[PDB]
RNA sequence: AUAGCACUCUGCAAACACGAAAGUGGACGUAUAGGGUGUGAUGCCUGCCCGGUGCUGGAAGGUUAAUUGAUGGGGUUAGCG
């Protein structure tokens, strides 16, 4: 709905939020919750390996069933829930046998709906089928790359892929990056779009909003001294060099992919 | 420094970073996501130049490193005068 705050204070002048009503307001299911700790972007040597990471609100991890192993048993959707660990909403599923699991809620799914996984499952949003049994021209999410590993592609809010063709052992899909790639037919996928497609319309409005999410401020390369950065130094403001990273890698147009193993699976590049 | 904006890279065993390796962070995340760079609420806006350096794509035309080893020349070695 794009709710906009009124300018009572300078920090609230440019605050705009997405509002959703169907979300469950209680606590998450305890049996499917475990503790997660902050890392600060440091590895097991104690050094910083990713910059601009720190602080943030305390969070719990939710165990999400990306695999969807339970096959043939129908499940009913209990509720839709907010998830701090991801931009998409999650859905609680109850199976006939009574087992409860979490899944990535597709767009439009609500409490009381029916979902299933298997080769013979009906073609409705939230149903998980092998790519072989999928109609051409379908819009899919949570695509799997390795048999049994689970969904890896098209998981963020609003994500989707287009199934263009399946001939022989391979199916061609267009990804949201604009690339066309081929996948083994026996890899599974899910029907429909993933919810919360308005997430990218949000406007944080102030620095504290990012500090809450755990992003430390970014210092430009020009603001440092020569010992710190290739961009550092000079009397006044001056660039004087082709832009590069702190470790010397050109940052404008230089390609970096080097994996030759999977080059076959790429039909048409996004034209990077 | 900041919220906002824009360029570029990354299809996941991701890019990037630490390490001598094992491995670890990125992330128990998956292009509405992650890294690098510049500008810096908002309003109106953001002209010309690809000659130079860089980057991206193509061309297969000239130059050749290891490698391989044609041919030639030389030392010594036999027998003859």
């Amino acid at each position: 709905p794009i709710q906009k705050c009124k300018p009572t204070s300078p920090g609230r002048r440019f605050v705009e939020k997405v509002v959703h009503d169907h979300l469950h307001k209680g606590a998450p299911y305890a049996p499917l919750v475990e503790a997660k700790k902050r890392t600060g972007g440091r590895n097991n040597n104690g050094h910083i390996t990713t910059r601009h990471v720190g602080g943030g609100h305390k969070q719990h991890y939710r165990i999400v069933d990306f695999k969807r192993n339970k096959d043939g048993v129908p499940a009913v959707v209990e509720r839709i829930e907010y998830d701090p660990n991801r931009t998409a909403h999650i859905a609680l599923l109850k199976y006939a046998d009574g087992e409860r699991r979490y899944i990535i809620a597709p767009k439009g799914l609500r409490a009381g709906d029916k979902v299933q996984s298997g080769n013979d499952a009906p073609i409705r949003p939230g149903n998980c089928l092998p790519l072989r049994n999928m109609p051409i021209g379908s819009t899919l999410h949570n695509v799997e790359l390795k048999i049994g590993k689970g969904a890896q592609l098209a998981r963020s809010a609003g994500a989707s892929v287009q199934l263009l063709g399946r001939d022989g052992s391979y199916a061609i899909i267009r990804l949201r990056s604009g690339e066309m790639r081929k996948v083994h037919v026996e890899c599974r996928a899910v029907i429909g779009e993933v919810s919360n497609q308005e997430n990218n319309l949000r406007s944080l409005g102030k620095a504290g909003a990012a500090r809450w999410r755990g992003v430390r401020p970014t210092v430009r390369g020009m603001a440092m001294n020569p010992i710190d950065h290739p961009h550092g130094g000079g009397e006044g403001r001056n660039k004087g060099i082709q832009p590069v990273s702190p470790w010397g890698q050109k940052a404008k147009g230089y390609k970096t992919r080097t994996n030759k193993r999977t080059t076959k699976m790429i039909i048409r590049d996004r034209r990077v």
Side-chain angles (χ1 to χ4, degrees):
Chain A
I2 296 77
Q3 181 181 5
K4 182 64 211 71
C5 272
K6 281 199 262 243
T8 41
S9 325
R12 291 271 272 193
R13 189 175 279 277
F14 310 99
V15 178
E16 156 281 339
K17 287 164 282 122
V18 189
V19 155
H20 292 135
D21 50 328
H22 54 280
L23 288 176
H24 175 73
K25 295 342 297 153
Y29 203 34
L32 295 177
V33 165
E34 58 176 59
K36 183 169 72 62
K37 316 142 208 283
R38 303 167 280 236
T39 68
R42 292 137 164 93
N43 70 346
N44 62 350
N45 289 332
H47 304 148
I48 297 167
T49 61
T50 296
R51 302 187 303 157
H52 315 143
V53 176
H57 205 288
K58 189 178 214 177
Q59 299 173 325
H60 278 111
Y61 187 67
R62 277 80 159 160
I63 301 145
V64 162
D65 179 332
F66 294 107
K67 287 170 175 204
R68 300 287 291 283
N69 304 114
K70 218 162 174 54
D71 219 56
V73 188
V76 61
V77 196
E78 237 179 288
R79 63 206 201 195
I80 311 305
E81 286 166 78
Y82 174 77
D83 196 347
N85 311 283
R86 61 188 82 264
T87 59
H89 303 323
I90 61 172
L92 182 56
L93 303 189
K94 183 214 226 213
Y95 286 76
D97 61 343
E99 150 162 51
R100 298 177 218 261
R101 308 242 201 84
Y102 274 133
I103 62 148
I104 300 293
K107 179 198 337 306
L109 217 72
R110 300 284 134 119
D113 304 353
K114 289 174 300 326
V115 300
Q116 197 168 88
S117 92
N119 308 8
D120 43 0
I123 303 209
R124 41 199 52 265
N127 281 23
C128 183
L129 293 87
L131 277 176
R132 226 176 37 80
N133 305 10
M134 305 286 318
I136 305 285
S138 184
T139 93
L140 308 176
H141 72 277
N142 273 30
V143 186
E144 170 194 281
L145 299 174
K146 302 188 177 194
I147 309 268
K149 203 183 183 177
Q152 281 187 290
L153 311 183
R155 316 204 318 195
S156 199
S160 73
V161 315
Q162 267 321 111
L163 169 55
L164 313 180
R166 64 179 140 87
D167 45 0
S169 302
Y170 295 112
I172 323 296
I173 55 165
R174 175 199 287 96
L175 306 157
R176 277 275 315 262
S177 74
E179 167 186 287
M180 313 195 28
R181 80 96 48 80
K182 54 191 307 303
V183 182
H184 186 78
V185 283
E186 259 71 71
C187 279
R188 277 129 74 99
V190 190
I191 292 127
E193 320 299 335
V194 52
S195 56
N196 200 34
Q197 77 156 320
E198 298 137 350
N199 154 270
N200 65 1
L201 298 177
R202 259 146 73 115
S203 171
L204 302 173
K206 57 169 206 183
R211 301 302 312 265
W212 301 337
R213 290 167 208 273
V215 179
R216 298 199 77 256
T218 304
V219 189
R220 291 165 301 113
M222 334 168 66
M224 308 163 154
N225 285 307
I227 178 168
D228 310 301
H229 206 276
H231 290 190
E235 281 298 73
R237 307 210 280 257
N238 190 226
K239 289 170 159 174
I241 165 176
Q242 184 66 224
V244 292
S245 79
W247 303 268
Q249 195 161 64
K250 277 149 165 67
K252 301 277 178 167
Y254 177 82
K255 282 177 195 193
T256 54
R257 151 182 264 272
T258 36
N259 192 8
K260 304 173 157 278
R261 208 177 19 106
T262 63
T263 304
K264 288 289 180 300
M265 282 330 120
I266 310 204
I267 282 99
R268 193 225 299 300
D269 176 59
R270 59 170 153 110
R271 249 65 65 71
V272 43

